[PDB]
Amino acid sequence: RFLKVKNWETDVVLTDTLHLKSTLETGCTEHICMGSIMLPVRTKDQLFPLAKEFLDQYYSSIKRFGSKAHMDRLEEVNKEIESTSTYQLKDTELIYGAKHAWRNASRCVGRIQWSKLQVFDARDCTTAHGMFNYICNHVKYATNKGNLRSAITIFPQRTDGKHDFRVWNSQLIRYAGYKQPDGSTLGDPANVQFTEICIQQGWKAPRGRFDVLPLLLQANGNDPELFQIPPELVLEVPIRHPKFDWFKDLGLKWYGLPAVSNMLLEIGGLEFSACPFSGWYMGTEIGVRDYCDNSRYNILEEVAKKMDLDMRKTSSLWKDQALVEINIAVLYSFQSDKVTIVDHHSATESFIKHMENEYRCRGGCPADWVWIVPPMSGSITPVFHQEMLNYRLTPSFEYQPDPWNTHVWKG
Amino acid sequence: RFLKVKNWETDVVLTDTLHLKSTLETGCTEHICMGSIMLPTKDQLFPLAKEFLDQYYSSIKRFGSKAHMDRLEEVNKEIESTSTYQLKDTELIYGAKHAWRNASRCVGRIQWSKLQVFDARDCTTAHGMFNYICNHVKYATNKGNLRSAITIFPQRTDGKHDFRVWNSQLIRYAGYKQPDGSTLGDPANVQFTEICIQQGWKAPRGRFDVLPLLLQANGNDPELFQIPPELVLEVPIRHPKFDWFKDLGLKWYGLPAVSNMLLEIGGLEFSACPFSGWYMGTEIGVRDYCDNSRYNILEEVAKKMDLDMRKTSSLWKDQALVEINIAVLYSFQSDKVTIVDHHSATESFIKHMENEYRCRGGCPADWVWIVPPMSGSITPVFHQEMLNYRLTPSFEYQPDPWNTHVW
Numbered sequence: 001r002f003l004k005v006k007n008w009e010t011d012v013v014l015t016d017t018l019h020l021k022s023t024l025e026t027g028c029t030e031h032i033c034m035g036s037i038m039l040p041v042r043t044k045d046q047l048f049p050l051a052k053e054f055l056d057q058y059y060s061s062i063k064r065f066g067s068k069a070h071m072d073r074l075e076e077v078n079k080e081i082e083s084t085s086t087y088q089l090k091d092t093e094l095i096y097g098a099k100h101a102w103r104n105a106s107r108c109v110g111r112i113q114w115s116k117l118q119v120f121d122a123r124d125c126t127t128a129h130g131m132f133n134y135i136c137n138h139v140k141y142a143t144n145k146g147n148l149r150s151a152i153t154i155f156p157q158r159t160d161g162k163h164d165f166r167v168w169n170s171q172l173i174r175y176a177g178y179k180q181p182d183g184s185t186l187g188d189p190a191n192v193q194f195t196e197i198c199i200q201q202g203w204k205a206p207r208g209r210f211d212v213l214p215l216l217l218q219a220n221g222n223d224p225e226l227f228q229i230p231p232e233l234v235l236e237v238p239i240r241h242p243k244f245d246w247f248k249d250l251g252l253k254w255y256g257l258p259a260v261s262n263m264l265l266e267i268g269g270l271e272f273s274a275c276p277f278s279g280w281y282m283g284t285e286i287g288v289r290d291y292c293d294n295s296r297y298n299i300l301e302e303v304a305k306k307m308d309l310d311m312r313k314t315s316s317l318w319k320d321q322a323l324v325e326i327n328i329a330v331l332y333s334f335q336s337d338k339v340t341i342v343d344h345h346s347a348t349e350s351f352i353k354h355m356e357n358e359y360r361c362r363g364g365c366p367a368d369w370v371w372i373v374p375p376m377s378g379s380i381t382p383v384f385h386q387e388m389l390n391y392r393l394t395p396s397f398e399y400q401p402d403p404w405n406t407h408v409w410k411g
Numbered sequence: 412r413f414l415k416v417k418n419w420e421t422d423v424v425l426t427d428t429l430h431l432k433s434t435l436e437t438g439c440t441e442h443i444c445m446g447s448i449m450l451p452t453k454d455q456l457f458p459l460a461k462e463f464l465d466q467y468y469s470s471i472k473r474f475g476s477k478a479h480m481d482r483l484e485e486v487n488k489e490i491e492s493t494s495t496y497q498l499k500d501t502e503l504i505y506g507a508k509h510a511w512r513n514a515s516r517c518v519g520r521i522q523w524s525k526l527q528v529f530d531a532r533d534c535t536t537a538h539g540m541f542n543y544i545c546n547h548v549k550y551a552t553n554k555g556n557l558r559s560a561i562t563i564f565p566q567r568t569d570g571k572h573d574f575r576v577w578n579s580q581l582i583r584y585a586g587y588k589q590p591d592g593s594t595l596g597d598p599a600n601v602q603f604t605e606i607c608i609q610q611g612w613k614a615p616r617g618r619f620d621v622l623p624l625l626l627q628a629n630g631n632d633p634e635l636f637q638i639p640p641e642l643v644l645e646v647p648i649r650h651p652k653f654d655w656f657k658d659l660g661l662k663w664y665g666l667p668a669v670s671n672m673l674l675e676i677g678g679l680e681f682s683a684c685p686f687s688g689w690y691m692g693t694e695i696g697v698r699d700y701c702d703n704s705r706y707n708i709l710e711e712v713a714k715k716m717d718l719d720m721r722k723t724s725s726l727w728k729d730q731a732l733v734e735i736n737i738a739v740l741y742s743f744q745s746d747k748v749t750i751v752d753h754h755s756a757t758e759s760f761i762k763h764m765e766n767e768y769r770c771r772g773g774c775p776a777d778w779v780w781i782v783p784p785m786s787g788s789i790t791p792v793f794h795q796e797m798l799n800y801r802l803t804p805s806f807e808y809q810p811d812p813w814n815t816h817v818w
């Protein structure tokens with residue numbers, strides 16, 4: 001079968017056949033679309049087909065499908081599964097798999113970059129101190145003094161589900177949030193609960209508006225351990241505005257390295273529960289979401305106040321005005337400090353070129369419109385007008401529950 | 412089977428039960444989500460009629476009453492005898508209000524129960540259709556104090572006698588492709604404008620020429636009519652701070668009035684059912700003015716603001732966009748023509764959703780359409796999970812008549 005997608009701005013029509021390799025479910029049915037829902041221990045039995053499908057994909061990619069090396073590797077993995085109940089990826093397969101999870105990540109607008117990913121193999125890691133060291137090296141390598149490089153670090157896979165590696169932080173670098181007795185929040189409200197866990201674990205909180213959180217790391221199903229990332233490794237950007245000299249006095253800054261640490265990488269049926277990965281920011285993630293979401297830093301009011309906008313009626317579009325200026329400030333600040341960042345016009349145009357290339361060479365590019373369209377100025381970006389098909393390919397990145405909810409405390 | 416939706420800003424969780432009454436299909440499967448696709452007999456009609464009359468009699472608290480059983484029988488007899496049936500005025504009004512209520516792509520549905528329904532089922536000619544439509548236009552406009560309305564022409568019979576309005580909206584601007592290669596007026600209407608002139612329209616060849624109505628009665632060839640200019644309320648566009656704004660010579664019409672859709676009530680199909688409300692500001696300022704394939708005025712505006720257009724990262728498009736949208740709202744508000752901003756409309760829709768969840772067990776909603784085309788995440792709808800499903804009565808898309816009609 002063939003599915004068609006249309007761009008309503010260009011009338012360019014693309015044909016998808018890759019959706020025929022989709023295995024996992026969407027959450028949608030013929031009767032309900034769950035396209036805007038945010039979140040919609042394996043047997044040998046379920047494991048060998050998944051291994052086989054993956055190795056068939058790996059061997060086709062290298063143009064060795066059905067070769068002796070392909071056949072020997074299937075047999076070898078087969079034997080490893082029956083005997084040990086799991087199996088180990090070759091380094092080449094791990095790299096391919098991690099690149100493909102990114103390539104297949106339908107919520108990611110940055111995927112033009114998928115084939116340039118530095119993979120750090122941390123599968124020999126055994127302790128939380130070992131994890132800390134790996135994660136420092138990743139941060140320093142990725143940061144590269146502002147010339148950011150995409151990277152992923154991959155800790156040992158799940159075994160019985162009792163011995164999981166996890167990074168408890170949702171991202172490697174984030175700011176503490178503190179709920180005050182009066183109900184206000186100091187710092188980042190998204191991180192209150194986690195900040196509270198860190199404090200309970202023994203973290204001494206400076207209690208400011210931009211305190212980089214400690215890493216809380218769990219190796220081999222053990223209780224998690226606290227580490228402070230060396231501050232010389234945490235690149236930050238003070239935020240100022242090119243025309244508005246009072247903007248600096250808002251006291252804003254942000255970190256340069258966006259690094260998701262709570263997701264699960266599935267490759268060939270294997271589950272890598274700790275696999276922090278990082279790229280560089282699109283300006284709107286900070287200027288729109290981190291700064292202006294009402295449940296985050298929520299700076300719209302204070303900015304529009306200082307711009308002397310008419311704030312008595314929403315129809316003055318004061319919020320929209322303050323929003324644009326903040327996003328100008330973020331991009332200006334990162335560029336001035338030579339820290340890599342991409343604006344939403346550039347990122348979306350690049351994504352459209354990526355998606356078109358993928359249709360020609362791959363037969364498709366699964367894409368989640370709800371996530372791909374930027375959270376400001378949607379329709380003046382080319383992605384708004386692009387029809388997309390969302391389906392699930394493996395290798396893949398997946399959500400997993402927060403570890404404080406499932407962890408068996410040892411003491 | 413019971414489904415939850417969460418608002419990620421407020422943590423409010425709602426439980427949807429209404430989806431289990433979903434009739435039609437979404438286009439999605441368990442393998443593939445088509446959420447962002449624009450367009451994804453006697454025997455058949457009685458189930459549809461019964462489904463509808465059941466929900467109608469339920470709504471007036473008369474479910475299972477003799478009058479309920481009697482109507483079901485009467486309709487049954489009429490279908491077996493005539494191969495269709497006719498709706499009571501009460502059923503027609505309820506059906507039309509419910510098609511709007513069910514419109515998952517509409518942010519304005521808090522209004523759904525205040526719809527003036529004009530019953531035009533006795534209409535027989537295009538001139539009659541023109542009369543009905545001028546009266547709708549005038550009623551709805553109400554000197555700028557806009558009132559929601561729908562006008563319902565006769566239902567489909569054998570499908571060879573369709574009533575259609577060929578216009579996509581009652582009021583739109585002409586589009587003409589030039590020897591220059593560029594486009595004068597609205598590029599969306601080039602083909603429709605080339606159907607008008609071909610049937611004999613006196614095209615003035617300007618940038619903002621209100622198109623003529625092209626009306627088809629009883630499956631006949633369509634005829635041209637000009638809406639009395641004093642019935643087409645238009646707004647010159649100016650900015651409250653930028654004096655030069657007026658010099659772009661921009662204007663828009665006050666009445667948004669979709670005229671190409673099909674109203675389905677109880678299996679009956681109303682192929683000509685123009686309806687209207689009032690604008691949300693972004694429809695004009697973001698979409699009409701700034702789409703690359705529309706009036707596409709961003710470049711001109713950014714220039715008069717003297718912004719740096721050398722690099723996308725100065726956000727010049729974004730800056731101009733906000734100002735263009737400030738101007739649209741200010742102009743409509745100054746000329747006292749009803750308009751809603753995207754902040755107000757989306758806050759009202761959140762209130763509406765909560766009402767529908769509380770009183771009806773859900774509210775079908777298409778997030779892709781409901782989130783405004785600018786400033787998405789600063790409106791509350793951005794953070795609201797929505798379930799999309801199809802309920803009847805409904806408005807549906809239908810083929811453009813020129814591809815279907817035989818002359």
Ligand code: HEM
Binds near residue numbers: 098107277279282347
């Ligand atoms: C290179 C620069 C990159 C840019 C500009 C970029 C951009 C983005 C943005 C804007 C999002 C949406 C995030 C949000 O709204 O919360 C996202 C999501 C995502 N990206 Fe990227 N990305 C980049 C690199 C990467 C890398 C290196 C990976 C992994 C190897 C990755 C995998 C993902 C995944 C799995 C998501 C979905 C996350 C979720 O559902 O929470 N991306 N990307």
Ligand code: HEM
Binds near residue numbers: 511514560686751806
């Ligand atoms: C009262 C003021 C109203 C407001 C502010 C409003 C708002 C909107 C908006 C912004 C859209 C998206 C349009 C687009 O982007 O193309 C829309 C779509 C729609 N509305 Fe409304 N609406 C109103 C009244 C009505 C009425 C009176 C009806 C029918 C009786 C209706 C039925 C629909 C339908 C069926 C769609 C989807 C049309 C399509 O798929 O192209 N709306 N609404």
Ligand SMILES: Cc1cc(N)nc(C[C@H]2CNC[C@H]2OCCNCc2ccccc2O)c1
Binds near residue numbers: 110260277
């Ligand atoms: C590798 C990478 C690069 C990039 N530019 N952005 C990202 C995403 C990071 C930085 N900005 C937002 C953050 O993503 C956080 C995870 N996604 C949001 C999310 C997912 C599930 C549930 C709740 C959520 O808030 C990752």
Ligand SMILES: Cc1cc(N)nc(C[C@H]2CNC[C@H]2OCCNCc2ccccc2O)c1
Binds near residue numbers: 449667
């Ligand atoms: C009753 C009503 C009120 C309102 N405020 N807006 C509307 C929608 C009107 C005003 N702006 C766009 C117009 O709807 C056009 C049709 N919708 C978009 C569409 C659908 C299918 C195919 C192509 C399209 O462009 C209707």
Ligand SMILES: C[C@H](O)[C@H](O)[C@H]1CNc2nc(N)[nH]c(=O)c2N1
Binds near residue numbers: 035037371372794796
């Ligand atoms: C309910 C809705 O799906 C949710 O708010 C989504 C919308 N789109 C998004 N898009 C991105 N990129 N990131 C997000 O967090 C969200 N949030």
Ligand SMILES: C[C@H](O)[C@H](O)[C@H]1CNc2nc(N)[nH]c(=O)c2N1
Binds near residue numbers: 008388448449
């Ligand atoms: C391809 C995509 O579905 C298309 O551009 C949609 C997106 N969301 C929309 N939302 C609204 N309200 N109106 C539209 O015309 C569109 N167009």
Ligand SMILES: [Zn+2]
Binds near residue numbers: 028032034439444
């Ligand atoms: Zn879907």
